[PDB]
Structure formats: C-alpha cells, structure tokens
C-alpha cells in the first residue's frame, strides 16, 4: 500500500567562515607603517626591526621601510622594515 | 646535645680523610662525603586536617624545625585515579650542619630504638649512593610523649651525597653512621 522511497537525512551540519591572514606583503615593495604585512595565527613570524606584532599575531608596518623579507633561516621567519631611503 | 654535635663533627671529619686515602688516592674529594638532607613523611592524605595535621606539626617541629597546619587531602586520594593539584608538600629541606648533628642524633643516637628496631637492610641507598632508608615508625620519643595516639609513623628522609658509586658511598655512611647488616 504505497512503495515510494523512505526517509533518510542523517546530518552533517558543518561550517567554517571564510578567512584571511598569511604572507601578504610583497618583497621590497614600498612598505609604510599602518600598512599591514603578514598576519599569523601562530609564530612563524618574529617582529624584527620596525616590525610590529599587533595584539593578535599580526605583522604590521612600524616604519617607513622597504619590504624587508628576513627569513632568518632556522631561527625562524624574521620580518624586517628597511630604513626608507 | 651540642655534645653529640661536636660528636658528628669529629666522627666524620676524621673518618673522612681516614678511608679517604685508605682507598681513594684521588685528591681527598667528596670521595665520598655527604651534603644537605631533605626529609619527607606520610603525605597529607594521612590527614584529619586540623588534628593529625597539627601533629605532623609538633613532629616536623621538635624534630628539625618546621611544624604542620590544617590541609591534608585536596584533589583527594579520592577513588583510585581521582586526584587534582598536590597541596600536601610536607617536608624539611634543611641544608647542612643542623643536618649533621642530625646524622648524629638520628642515625647514631636513635637508630635502634623501639620494637625489634634491628636493621638488617640490603643495599640501603644504592640508587647512586645518596641515601635510602626512612624507617616505618618514628624515633618514638625523639622527644614528645602521647601528643596523639597514632600520631605519626610513615617516616622517611634522604641525604644529598657525593658518595658517588655505591661500594664507595658504602664506605661512607657504613663506617660513618652504621651499615645495617647484609
């Protein structure tokens, strides 16, 4: 008396908003304070000279510097801002 | 009292060079002397809090300077694997001389003293020649009388020695404070 399918909605209600962060400011490019560079939800980044780590593990330009990519090899990743020009 | 003080002083001072070169021939170093002595006893869970905690007091006290308050069962022994922080650190880490009139009074003057208190213990320290042996019953009246029926018993102390390897350490407190049988 009525063979038509059957209920079946087990459920995987999963979700994660999109995001940002990362290696976000190109070699050498003109990098001014206020200008953010590389955000890290960790510590792949050590705020070297003029590199200001914001109250969030966010690499922000502390000075008018040329984009200073300072991978200090093994010490870890070290970010730096070079004395303008 | 200060009697046995001068005593340990000498026992060791001389015995030291004694065996020191008797076998050493290093440079009369901690080959093999003894330094500082911590003492530990029957953990707070042995508690009643106010009562036997204060008794732990009396005892730690007249014994070597330090005597218990009221807190001995937190994060509780509870049921088997039931325990949290560790607010029951009741011990004396006193460091030197006091310690020696102690090697004295203690080992050499209270050693055998109560119920078959013989001492026929194998490899006393042996865990690197530094201590081992704590006794499982107080020096009864190392002072005080009935100031608690069960009062205390789980007693065990430890010395910080340099009597490096055993045989050596053995020479050390063996003749210095008595090596309990085989």
């Amino acid at each position: 008396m009525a063979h038509k399918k059957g209920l079946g909605s087990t459920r995987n209600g999963r979700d994660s908003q999109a995001k940002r962060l990362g290696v976000k400011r190109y070699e050498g490019q003109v990098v001014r304070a206020g200008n953010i560079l590389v955000r890290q939800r960790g510590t792949r980044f050590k705020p070297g000279k003029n590199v200001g780590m914001g109250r969030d593990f966010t690499l922000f330009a502390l000075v008018d510097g040329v984009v200073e990519f300072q991978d200090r090899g093994r010490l870890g990743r070290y970010v730096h801002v070079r004395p303008l020009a | 009292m200060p009697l046995d003080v001068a005593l340990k002083r000498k026992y060791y001072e001389e015995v030291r060079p004694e065996l020191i070169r008797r076998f050493g021939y290093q440079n009369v170093w901690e080959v093999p002397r003894l330094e500082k002595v911590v003492i530990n006893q029957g953990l707070g869970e042995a508690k009643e809090d106010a009562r036997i905690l204060e008794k732990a007091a009396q005892e730690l006290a007249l014994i070597t300077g330090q005597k218990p308050a009221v807190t001995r069962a937190k994060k509780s022994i509870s049921n088997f694997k039931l325990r949290k922080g560790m607010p029951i650190g009741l011990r004396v880490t006193l460091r030197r001389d006091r310690m020696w009139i102690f090697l004295e009074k203690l080992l050499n003057v209270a050693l055998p003293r109560i119920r078959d208190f013989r001492g026929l213990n194998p490899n006393s320290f042996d865990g690197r020649g530094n201590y081992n042996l704590g006794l499982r019953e107080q020096l009864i009246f190392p002072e005080i009388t009935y100031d608690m029926v069960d009062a205390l018993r789980g007693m065990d102390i430890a010395v910080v020695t340099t009597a490096e390897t055993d045989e050596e350490a053995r020479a050390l407190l063996e003749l210095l404070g008595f090596p309990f049988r085989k």
Binding site: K5, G6, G8, S9, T10, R11, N12 | -
Partner: protein
C-alpha cells in the same frame, strides 16, 4: 578481514600506483592491474592457499582490509549523508608485492596461488625472489 578498531568512517576514491615489490619467503603472488580488493575475497585466497597446502605450514600476508566501502542506502534514491559502512578491503594497484609462504616447495604453491588469485579479482602475476634488496 581485519581493519579493526579503525578511527574514521570513510575514505574516497582514485587509484594509480604505489610501493609493493620485495619478496619475503619466495612464494609470491603479486597483483598487477587492480585497485581495492575485498578483504573477503582476500580471505578467500587465504583459504584457498591454506587449504591446498596439506592444510598447515603457514602462508604469510600482504595487503590489508584497509578502507570502508559504502553503497550507502540499500537501494533508495540518493542523498543520504552518504553514511553507512559496509564492505572493507585492500587498496593495491600497481602489480603489488602480495606475499604467501607455507613450504609447498613447488608448482604446488603455484596452484595454490593459481586459484587463489585467478579468483581474486584481476589481471595479475606471480613468482619468487629475483633481485634481493639492501637496506640500512
């Protein structure tokens, strides 16, 4: 089969090549053109062999009951959480080092395999130890 005390529910699907080769006794069954193979079928061979071999002196192993295959429903219409666990098996694809001993000493072992796999489920080949292998 055996893929006991797993950890997750299901895998996914692909295939292409891997890392099976060696030897391990000199009575070898190597796949060639497969993919996953029923842990069962597997046991099948296991049997086949075991039995043939005067029924005693042990064979060895090879792959494992590896993944969880799901036909999900039972035959419904499709949209389940794709749930349902159901058939568990091997994931071997480039002629793989499938290793089986016993002490047959011969084309007897041969037969054993012959059927075991002839059976099993693919274009495959068999042999022995042909170019040793040096490790650290």
């Amino acid at each position: 089969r055996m893929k006991y005390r797993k950890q997750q529910r299901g895998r996914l699907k692909g295939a292409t090549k891997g890392g099976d080769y060696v030897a391990f006794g000199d009575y070898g069954l190597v796949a060639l053109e497969p993919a996953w193979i029923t842990a069962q079928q597997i046991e099948a061979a296991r049997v086949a062999m075991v039995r043939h071999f005067r029924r005693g002196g042990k064979i060895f192993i090879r792959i494992f009951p590896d993944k969880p295959y799901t036909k999900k429903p039972l035959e419904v219409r499709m949209g389940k959480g794709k749930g349902n666990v159901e058939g568990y098996v091997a994931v071997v694809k480039p002629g793989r080092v499938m290793f089986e001993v016993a002490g047959v000493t011969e084309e007897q072992a041969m037969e054993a395999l012959r059927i075991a796999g002839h059976k099993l489920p693919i274009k495959t080949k068999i042999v022995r130890r042909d170019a040793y292998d040096e490790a650290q």
